[PDB]
Paper text:
Class A plexins (PlxnAs) act as semaphorin receptors and control diverse aspects of nervous system development and plasticity, ranging from axon guidance and neuron migration to synaptic organization. Plexins are large type 1 transmembrane proteins comprising typically ten domains in their extracellular segment, a single membrane spanning region that is predicted to be helical and a conserved, cytoplasmic region that contains a GTPase-activating protein (GAP) domain with a Rho GTPase-binding domain insert. This work reveals a 2-fold role of the PlxnA ectodomains: imposing a pre-signaling autoinhibitory separation for the cytoplasmic domains via intermolecular head-to-stalk interactions and supporting dimerization-based PlxnA activation upon ligand binding.
This indicates that some flexibility is present in the extracellular segment of plexins. Some flexibility in the stalk is evident on comparison of the 13 different structures and contributes to the ring diameter ranging from 84 Å to 99 Å. This interface is formed by blades 1–3 of the sema domain of one plexin molecule and the outer side of domains 4-5 (PSI2-IPT2) from the ring of a second plexin. The residues in this interface are conserved among vertebrate PlxnAs but much less among all plexins, suggesting that this plexin–plexin interaction may be an important functional feature of PlxnAs.
Author numbering:
A (entry chain A): 37 to 1036
B (entry chain B): 37 to 951
Amino acid sequence: PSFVTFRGEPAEGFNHLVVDERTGHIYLGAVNRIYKLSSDLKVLVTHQTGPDEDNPKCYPPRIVQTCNEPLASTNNVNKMLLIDYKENRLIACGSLYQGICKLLRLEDLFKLGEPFHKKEHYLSGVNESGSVFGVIVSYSNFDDKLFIATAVDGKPEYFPTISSRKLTKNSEADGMFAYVFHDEFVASMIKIPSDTFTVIPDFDIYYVYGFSSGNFVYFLTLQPEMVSPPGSTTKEQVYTSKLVRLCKEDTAFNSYVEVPIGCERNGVEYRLLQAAYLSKAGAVLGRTLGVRPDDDLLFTVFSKGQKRKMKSLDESALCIFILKQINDRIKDRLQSCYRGEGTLDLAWLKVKDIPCSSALLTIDDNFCGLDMNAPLGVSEMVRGIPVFTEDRDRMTSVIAYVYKNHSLAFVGTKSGKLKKIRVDGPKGNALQYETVQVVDSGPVLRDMAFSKDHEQLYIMSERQLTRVPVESCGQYRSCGECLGSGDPHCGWCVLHNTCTRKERCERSREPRRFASEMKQCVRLTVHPNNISVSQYNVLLVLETYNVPELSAGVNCTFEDLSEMDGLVIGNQIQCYSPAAKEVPRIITENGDHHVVQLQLKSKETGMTFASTSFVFYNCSVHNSCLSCVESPYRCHWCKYRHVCTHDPNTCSFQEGRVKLPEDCPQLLRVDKILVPVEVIKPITLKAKNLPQPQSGQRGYECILNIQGIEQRVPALRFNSSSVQCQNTSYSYEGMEINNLPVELTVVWNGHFNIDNPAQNKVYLYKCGAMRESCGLCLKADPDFECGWCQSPGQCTLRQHCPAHESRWLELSGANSKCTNPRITEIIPVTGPREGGTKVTIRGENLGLEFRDIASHVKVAGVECSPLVDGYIPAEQIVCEMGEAKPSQHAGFVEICVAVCRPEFMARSSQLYYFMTLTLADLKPNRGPMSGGTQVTITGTNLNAGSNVVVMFGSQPCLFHRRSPSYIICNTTSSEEVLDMKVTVQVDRARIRQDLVFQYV
Amino acid sequence: PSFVTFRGEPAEGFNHLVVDERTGHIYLGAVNRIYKLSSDLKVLVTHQTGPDEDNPKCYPPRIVQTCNEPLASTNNVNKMLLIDYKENRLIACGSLYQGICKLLRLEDLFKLGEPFHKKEHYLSGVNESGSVFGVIVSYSNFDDKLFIATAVDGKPEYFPTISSRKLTKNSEADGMFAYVFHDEFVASMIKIPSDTFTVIPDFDIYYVYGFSSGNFVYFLTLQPEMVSPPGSTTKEQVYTSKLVRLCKEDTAFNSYVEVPIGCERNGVEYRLLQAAYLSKAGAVLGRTLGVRPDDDLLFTVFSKGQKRKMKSLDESALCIFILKQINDRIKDRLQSCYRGEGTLDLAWLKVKDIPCSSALLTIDDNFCGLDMNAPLGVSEMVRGIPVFTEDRDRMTSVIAYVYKNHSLAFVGTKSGKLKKIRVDGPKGNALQYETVQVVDSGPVLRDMAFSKDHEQLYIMSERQLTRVPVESCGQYRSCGECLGSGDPHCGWCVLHNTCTRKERCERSREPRRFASEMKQCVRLTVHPNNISVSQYNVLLVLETYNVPELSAGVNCTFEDLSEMDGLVIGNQIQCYSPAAKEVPRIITENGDHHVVQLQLKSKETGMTFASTSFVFYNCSVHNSCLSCVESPYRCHWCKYRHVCTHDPNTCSFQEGRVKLPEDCPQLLRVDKILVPVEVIKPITLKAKNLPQPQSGQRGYECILNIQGIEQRVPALRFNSSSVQCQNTSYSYEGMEINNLPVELTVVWNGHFNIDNPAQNKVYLYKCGAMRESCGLCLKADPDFECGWCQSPGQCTLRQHCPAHESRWLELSGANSKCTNPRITEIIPVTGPREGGTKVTIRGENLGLEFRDIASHVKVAGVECSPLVDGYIPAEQIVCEMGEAKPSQHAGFVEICVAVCRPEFMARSSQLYYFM
């Protein structure tokens, strides 16, 4: 939705706004223009007040007398605007005339009159807008007048800052703007003294806001540095914001009072008034405030500090004053002066301090002021009660009103936004909402008025007027959300199922028709929360609370899908579930269950207000016993029918029903099922609650899901808990993998698959696909019964290998030597003569125990000692060679399993070579002291032996890789010093040489 | 249009005229000529009757016997003319033959015969025309005759004045003009007795008019003084006009009767017949006259008094006689004689009075006369009913006729004009029209006859015959004029838009087609009389009365500008106004309003007959409030818009409307606005209904229109009735004139000038351009406040002169003595020594009061006394010098203002000289 607005009809400018209480027409003061608009902000009429040839310096403007100074077309700013209902007109006081005032007719804006001739007719030279304010007060004839305050600009002789002036019936009449009582000695006006001007050059009083209360007139003002801040001579100007008051009845002007005003937040001072608004509290605020219904309140806005009235600070605070409290402060002050204590203390007015005179008097609120102890100031600054503070974006303006007793406050911001604040000190809370009806880039003005009907709030900007509704609750879809937002205007119109204000809800006055608090929402419950898909037209009872009288009629709508009529009895609603024809259309593809939001559609509104979680659950869809029972819902499984249903009767017969998950027909696990390929073997199974096949039903089968071949073997069900597939052999083609797990499915009557929770599988394993060597087979589990068969040179079960001889060989309990050891290949081919090398020998048919191999290994003559941890049985032996000093140079490797028997020994195909490695040169000769240099050691036979260590300066080098020609290592820090020697030690041999490494 | 006429074909002369009933041919008797003319007055044929060698004195003219007296070629005057239809000829009796008569053939004017031989063939020596008359009466054969009367000229033996004569079929026949019955004792003729001639030498009977009526023959005659007026011996002759009558049937001539006739108007006597005409009354006159249809009437014309038959008086009166009334007078007279009372009383005929004899008789109208109490006269003169009298221009002739029962009378005048008179004694009214068809300078003759068709009336003059239409209504342009003339023939042929007779108007019989009375002329009204310029095609209803059936079709034409079709319903016509496009073309430049004559154009004729005042009213043109409201029309002024408009709504707003003139905006006058040059002064003004300037409107200014410099000074409007220009000074360059009035215009909002009805002005005045002397300034009005300032030697306001001393001098109320008197010049330079001279001395700086100057003046030693009235203060002194007898001869003039102080005296530049 967009907000209705009026763009600066003169796109050029804007200054003041006011609303006519009866009509709702909105009048807008502006520079060079005054507009009359409809409530909708349509342009009713435009008046041209503007550009006049003039000059501020000239006194009586050009029309009255000739001015030496040159004139220029200048803009006439609407300083003030006030509606005079009685007169049926508008006082629209401008400037640039020496401040001549104009009278515009209410309906047409016809200029009734604009008195220029006399001195009184001129208000002030001041060009600034809003620095002026005032009130129009009227009574029947022979009782009446206008109170207005304006800045002087140092014009003290020409104009009075505050005055009490006359407003005659005839706009033509000369008398206008004349002082109510003029005497040579005293006139109903207050001028600024010349002495005060000389002392402080710039002193001026700017009047922000003004209002009539009871029988007085108050003004919120800004003044200069006078004893504040202290200063010997002129320099900087800071302002003090004060409150002023007058009796309406005092022609003498004796009643004048002036108290400084502000408020502080946690040690932060807020001295400067931006705007104010007098209003009522309403029952809520008033009660906790402790006020009478009639008592008034004053919302205000202040900026931080005393500095720069022209351009104030962002920091701003909304404070509050109860009029009773201010009245007390004034009465308190007066009762004091009457005591005779102290001075009057009003710096700008009276330079020389006059003392207060004591006197006997009954000091009342009615007190209008007396001749002695005449106009007076105030010592104690009146503090206000803080409400909301904005640091980031300065508040510009404020308004407030009573709504259903709750007090709503409106606050303009520098940004062009409005805040809707419920004041709850007297209640309990804070800011409800913020809105940007206005103008996204830049600010709002003090003239912000609510409409007469109080539906909207016209918000004025420099550029445009915007009709911001005090309420747009419609945005809220649900009772939970509506009441959730908290912006006080919104309530849940239960029957309408919409969110709006009290006025908007038809028949909201009636009970439970309208909901204010979340508790009131609507709460709904359905007795049969869960209904099965199979059921149809089931009776449901609805319990609803906090709902208005439904006698209009109600319908139950499960969703957009269906709607059934309902009848009301007691405090309940009775509706029926949908038909089976209707229910499954929903259920399809949702499967297990579908929660649906059952709503209530009211007959009068026709909108769904209340909802509940309604479950459609259908047992039949479940394909298996586990899903049926084990699932989350109440469903029964029929073992025989093999169908899941809600009704017990539907099952085949009594013994057939499955209520509990344990009872489901399922296969229990046993020790792993091992199955050799090509062997005829039975496979016994255990299980529970296996059904006895009924008439027209076949027996059990075992189905193995092997990708290569799927086997169907019939089986026998011995009892409710045991099964067995008949003697058969299984195979898979490929010989790719030794152990292949296979899923097995037990079926009966052809299709019926018994549940397998564990998902037990059959392991098909093949006699040595994996083991070519006798040592490997005997190594494997004794369970397999797989063993080595000598004649074939292969390994299989006894069943599998023919017995020419009485025996096929099986490790009886490891007491089985395994023959013809062979050596495939060994690592480090070469080694150092000194020894210490770790030889890694890899063979096929070695000894099973370490103890036998130890002492077995020999390299030629040289004794080699094997390592236990390193040794992997019958596959590999890691052995460390001893001292090689012998004459051989190169020799074959021999392993004798236990004993060096002729059958029992193995010799290496290629011989182990012994060598004296030498090093010629280093790739980098030099490197930094810190080290970390990649050294390239070149030489011959560098690969020999087991261990290698490189030492530069006896400090170790970090080894990387080794080769026959090359050794690569990273240098250590030569903490020692520049230069150094290189020692390489392989095993017991330590070789050195002339090649040196130089540290740089 | 011009009237058809026949000029004296003989340009030389003219005498008688007659019209042939069947043909319409007009025969005209003249001297030496007889003409036959067409109805149109074209010349058909001319006959030469004229100049014959002859002599009046000779009896049987030269042809019969030789005459001793010398002959001379003389003119033959046509004495008489009579149409003999039966005979198919014209009897045209001449003179100069001893009055031989001629017979001219009807068609060709071929002379059938002219009997000269016998005595009867000679009628009378008398040369005068028109003194003769008579009638031709005819019947089938063996019944017939001619009755003719003529003057004798003292020829009593030769010719009979009245006779009954024979008219034979053959013009050649000898018998012609023989007496019907001739006996030795009595013949059908009446002669004048010789005795009567001796007594009165000149006696003669002149016969003016004659006509046959019923079965008688009447003659209107003029006779001499016989017992009237009484006179012992001959001297002067006056005439008595009488009526004569005879039975057609009386061969004996016993029936002769003779009554004097005349009429009187308010004690004025009209005795002499100029002409007469027998006619019918028609239904109108007859009814109120109380007559039968057949009964006749006799219109006549008489001059005042008994004097000069040869040249009668201008005063003349048209009288009337009903034949029944005259017949009664005659019967009454006869029944009386038969009573045996009195004498016959006929002076000229019977010198010795014979008595009437009584006898038993049934006296009827039929009575033809008897042997005893034979021809007789009459005592009681028969009076006639007067009709019209002309004092200035004498009536000469008359005719009358019946038209649609109204009786129209025609009367010739000495001037050559014809009057068309409806006689309405029996009806009610007088003379309708006068015409000069004839001859503008000089008169018309008795022979005036209407045509057979009665379309025209041939009017004869000495010089020319003129065909005057009875009717020539075409001359009249408008219904108002047509019916205005009153000559009864004319009516307004509405659709034709012309003026003519009933016969001439086609379809006049139909209703409202023809208008007889002015009332009938056309009256038109339009319901929406006033329509605004802004409006277009407005429905208008037309009310017309006295109009013929329009079903032919009608169009509405506002003027020559536009024309809109109309439809007829009821007794109204509905037309539409013109479009806005059309209406303003007219309105432009007429301004306030334009009255237009909306006419109706008839479809059949195509001429606009009826009109009305139609108003187009444009308010907008009015520039000011006064013109808008104060003017003559309904217009409203909008104070705020400052525009004038017809619609109230158009004004800015309700409070802004100006309906009344008082409410406007105008400047009221105050005592004259005096403005000194070079002085800062405010000028307060008074006024009424000054507007309060509305939004977007500026304030008031005072603009002075001074040719040298125009000043714009802003002002303040205190209230609806007062203004004031701000402190300023004004000047004009030139120093030419002291008092300069200047027009001032008060304006607001720049251009808007407030109305200034009085046209009040500001008087800019500047202190003595005119007065070099202290005496002159103090003399001037106290109002100016201008006064003499001693130190400067000049004169200006106090404001203008610095006060070293407490005073500048102003005549407080004339109590202010004034220095240095001078004498420019004095009049009478010279004077007599004796004195008494009035010396007029003109100077510059004299005394303010007379009392001081008196005794001041001296001419040298001689004391001179000044005159109060003559003395104009400080400018001039009029003084009278005393006795100069002193030795000086010449001396200088001296004036001492109050006292002859050394500073205070003035002496003349040039001296006064005594001689």
